[PDB]
Scaffold this motif. Structure first.
Motif, PDB file in Angstrom:
ATOM      1  N   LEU A  59       0.856  -1.188   0.000  1.00  0.00           N
ATOM      2  CA  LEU A  59       0.000   0.000   0.000  1.00  0.00           C
ATOM      3  C   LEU A  59       0.892   1.238   0.000  1.00  0.00           C
ATOM      4  O   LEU A  59       2.086   1.142   0.299  1.00  0.00           O
ATOM      5  N   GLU A  60       0.320   2.399  -0.318  1.00  0.00           N
ATOM      6  CA  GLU A  60       1.097   3.635  -0.374  1.00  0.00           C
ATOM      7  C   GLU A  60       0.472   4.760   0.449  1.00  0.00           C
ATOM      8  O   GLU A  60      -0.747   4.849   0.565  1.00  0.00           O
ATOM      9  N   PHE A  61       1.319   5.611   1.019  1.00  0.00           N
ATOM     10  CA  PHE A  61       0.863   6.807   1.716  1.00  0.00           C
ATOM     11  C   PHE A  61       1.880   7.919   1.527  1.00  0.00           C
ATOM     12  O   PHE A  61       2.969   7.860   2.084  1.00  0.00           O
ATOM     13  N   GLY A  62       1.528   8.939   0.756  1.00  0.00           N
ATOM     14  CA  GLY A  62       2.456  10.023   0.497  1.00  0.00           C
ATOM     15  C   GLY A  62       2.002  11.318   1.132  1.00  0.00           C
ATOM     16  O   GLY A  62       1.019  11.344   1.872  1.00  0.00           O
ATOM     17  N   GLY A  63       2.731  12.395   0.850  1.00  0.00           N
ATOM     18  CA  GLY A  63       2.367  13.711   1.333  1.00  0.00           C
ATOM     19  C   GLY A  63       3.005  14.113   2.649  1.00  0.00           C
ATOM     20  O   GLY A  63       2.639  15.141   3.220  1.00  0.00           O
ATOM     21  N   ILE A  64       3.944  13.311   3.147  1.00  0.00           N
ATOM     22  CA  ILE A  64       4.681  13.696   4.343  1.00  0.00           C
ATOM     23  C   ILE A  64       5.512  14.925   3.993  1.00  0.00           C
ATOM     24  O   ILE A  64       6.377  14.887   3.122  1.00  0.00           O
ATOM     25  N   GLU A  65       5.213  16.034   4.653  1.00  0.00           N
ATOM     26  CA  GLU A  65       5.848  17.301   4.323  1.00  0.00           C
ATOM     27  C   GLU A  65       7.170  17.456   5.061  1.00  0.00           C
ATOM     28  O   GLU A  65       7.414  16.761   6.047  1.00  0.00           O
ATOM     29  N   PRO A  66       8.045  18.350   4.568  1.00  0.00           N
ATOM     30  CA  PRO A  66       9.181  18.738   5.405  1.00  0.00           C
ATOM     31  C   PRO A  66       8.610  19.284   6.702  1.00  0.00           C
ATOM     32  O   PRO A  66       7.590  19.971   6.641  1.00  0.00           O
ATOM     33  N   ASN A  67       9.224  18.972   7.838  1.00  0.00           N
ATOM     34  CA  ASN A  67       8.569  19.172   9.130  1.00  0.00           C
ATOM     35  C   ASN A  67       7.224  18.449   9.120  1.00  0.00           C
ATOM     36  O   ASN A  67       6.175  19.087   9.051  1.00  0.00           O
ATOM     37  N   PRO A  68       7.256  17.107   9.163  1.00  0.00           N
ATOM     38  CA  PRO A  68       6.034  16.301   9.064  1.00  0.00           C
ATOM     39  C   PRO A  68       4.995  16.679  10.119  1.00  0.00           C
ATOM     40  O   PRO A  68       5.313  16.719  11.308  1.00  0.00           O
ATOM     41  N   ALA A  69       3.771  16.957   9.676  1.00  0.00           N
ATOM     42  CA  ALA A  69       2.717  17.423  10.573  1.00  0.00           C
ATOM     43  C   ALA A  69       2.077  16.285  11.362  1.00  0.00           C
ATOM     44  O   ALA A  69       1.822  15.208  10.822  1.00  0.00           O
ATOM     45  N   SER A  95      12.948  13.750   6.598  1.00  0.00           N
ATOM     46  CA  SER A  95      11.576  14.122   6.920  1.00  0.00           C
ATOM     47  C   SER A  95      10.633  12.921   6.820  1.00  0.00           C
ATOM     48  O   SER A  95       9.804  12.691   7.702  1.00  0.00           O
ATOM     49  N   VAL A  96      10.764  12.155   5.742  1.00  0.00           N
ATOM     50  CA  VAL A  96       9.927  10.975   5.554  1.00  0.00           C
ATOM     51  C   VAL A  96      10.276   9.937   6.605  1.00  0.00           C
ATOM     52  O   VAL A  96       9.396   9.308   7.196  1.00  0.00           O
ATOM     53  N   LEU A  97      11.572   9.776   6.841  1.00  0.00           N
ATOM     54  CA  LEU A  97      12.053   8.828   7.838  1.00  0.00           C
ATOM     55  C   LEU A  97      11.511   9.165   9.219  1.00  0.00           C
ATOM     56  O   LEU A  97      10.958   8.304   9.900  1.00  0.00           O
ATOM     57  N   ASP A  98      11.649  10.426   9.620  1.00  0.00           N
ATOM     58  CA  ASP A  98      11.242  10.850  10.957  1.00  0.00           C
ATOM     59  C   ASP A  98       9.746  10.652  11.188  1.00  0.00           C
ATOM     60  O   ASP A  98       9.328  10.134  12.225  1.00  0.00           O
ATOM     61  N   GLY A  99       8.944  11.057  10.215  1.00  0.00           N
ATOM     62  CA  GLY A  99       7.510  10.909  10.315  1.00  0.00           C
ATOM     63  C   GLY A  99       7.122   9.446  10.375  1.00  0.00           C
ATOM     64  O   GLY A  99       6.185   9.060  11.065  1.00  0.00           O
ATOM     65  N   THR A 100       7.848   8.616   9.641  1.00  0.00           N
ATOM     66  CA  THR A 100       7.523   7.202   9.621  1.00  0.00           C
ATOM     67  C   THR A 100       7.891   6.556  10.957  1.00  0.00           C
ATOM     68  O   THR A 100       7.197   5.656  11.433  1.00  0.00           O
TER      69      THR A 100
END
Ligand code: CL
Ligand code: ZN
Length: 380
Positions: A59-69, A95-100
């Motif tokens: 599955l996919e989930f995108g849109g993680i912004e810089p400074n993930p909200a 950013s993607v790593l941190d949010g994940t």
């Protein structure tokens, strides 16, 4: 001195290293691939990940912004528990790593209680997390999440939110714009000296390894700009930068981070790139702290820049100038005036430092507001 060092992430490094990805994930996993703004779609990197995992439940989930909200990450936490995702795969940068990392921990946080106490506790209370890996398009326990709804941004660390693996293929860095390549080199360089140009504690391995990273960045960093598709060059820079961010060089030695803390207020207030703020603050800070940092500045001058002749002050001056010049030749200017800032914002910057509790900075806890003032002023 004493230390507790743990680096559990398996590194899959090199050209075509994505060939090792599939075997790291259970054949019957339900995988959620996370990503940022969509550049990984355009480059073909996401397609390579999808191809590597073809036939698996993805599955996919995108849109993680810089400074993930905190907003968006919770939406992913929703999808994860609803669809019963069993593995997360972050594709992108820090950013993607941190949010994940946050999604992985939040997901096994109890049902009802709110996940924001991950950030309140700095991840100290995380007992388990959804397994996760990553495919890094640039170098990156350790995640800085923003609520943005009123501009938060806290950090958290946990031995459980660390990726089980990281795929590092230098070829994926070929497409980075020069701005991002130069910033990455500067940020890696500064992360290294935040943990090395401090106080002598006779930690010889830590010193040699830090010196080694710096020497490598000085040699091949400029080449990464001139020769963006030179594999050996891009590989050395990627691997060096990974070590600059990684843990061995900081284990058991004094750490500064005042350059980062001062720099952070320039980004917050004026929008400068992270690395630009570091290039500005570091040489001004080093001159200001040349007393307490004297021994390691001289060691740095000799070991990294081959500066051996002249007085201590001349050698330190030459080392600071060589560092400034290195940043400038990468295309990263080192004075506030280069960015159109005349220093009139310094009173506002100092107010922000005080608001943020950044009033005792440095490895000696001696960079008080009046010292920070002198550093910003000298950086004009
Ligand atoms: Cl399979
Ligand atoms: Zn940094």
């Amino acid at each position: 001195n004493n230390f507790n060092l743990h680096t559990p992430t398996r590194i899959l490094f090199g050209k075509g290293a994505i060939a090792g990805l599939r075997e790291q994930i259970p054949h019957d996993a339900r995988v959620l691939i996370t990503y940022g703004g969509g550049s990984v779609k355009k480059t073909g990197v996401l397609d390579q990940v999808l191809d590597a995992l073809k036939g698996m439940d993805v599955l996919e989930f995108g849109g993680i912004e810089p400074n993930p909200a905190y907003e968006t990450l919770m939406n992913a936490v929703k999808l994860v528990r609803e669809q019963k995702v069993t593995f997360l795969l972050a594709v992108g940068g820090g950013s993607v790593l941190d949010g994940t990392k946050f999604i992985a921990a939040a997901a096994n946080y109890p049902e009802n209680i709110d996940p924001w106490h991950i950030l309140q506790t700095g991840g100290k209370e995380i007992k388990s997390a959804i397994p996760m890996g990553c495919v890094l398009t640039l170098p990156a326990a350790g995640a800085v999440i923003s609520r943005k709804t009123t501009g938060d941004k806290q950090a958290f660390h946990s031995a459980h939110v660390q990726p089980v693996f990281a795929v590092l293929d230098p070829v994926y860095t070929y497409t980075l714009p020069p701005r991002q390549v130069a910033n990455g080199v500067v940020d890696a360089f500064v992360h290294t000296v935040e943990q090395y140009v401090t106080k002598p504690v006779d930690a010889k391995i830590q010193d040699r390894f830090a010196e080694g990273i710096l020497l490598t960045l000085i040699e091949d960093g400029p080449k990464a700009l001139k020769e963006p598709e030179n594999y050996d060059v891009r590989a050395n820079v990627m691997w060096a930068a990974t070590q600059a961010e990684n843990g061995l060089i900081g284990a058991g030695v004094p750490q500064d981070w005042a350059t980062h803390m001062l720099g952070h207020e320039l980004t917050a207030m004026h929008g400068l790139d992270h690395a630009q703020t570091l290039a500005i603050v570091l040489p001004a800070l080093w001159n200001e702290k040349r007393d307490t940092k004297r021994a390691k500045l001289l060691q740095y001058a000799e070991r990294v820049w081959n500066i051996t002749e002249g007085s201590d002050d001349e050698r330190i001056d030459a080392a600071i100038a060589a560092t400034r010049n290195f940043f400038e030749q990468l295309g990263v200017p080192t004075h506030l005036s280069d960015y159109g800032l005349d220093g009139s914002s310094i009173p506002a910057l100092l107010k922000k430092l005080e608001e943020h509790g950044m009033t005792q900075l440095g490895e000696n806890h001696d960079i008080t507001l009046d010292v920070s003032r002198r550093i910003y002023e000298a950086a004009r």
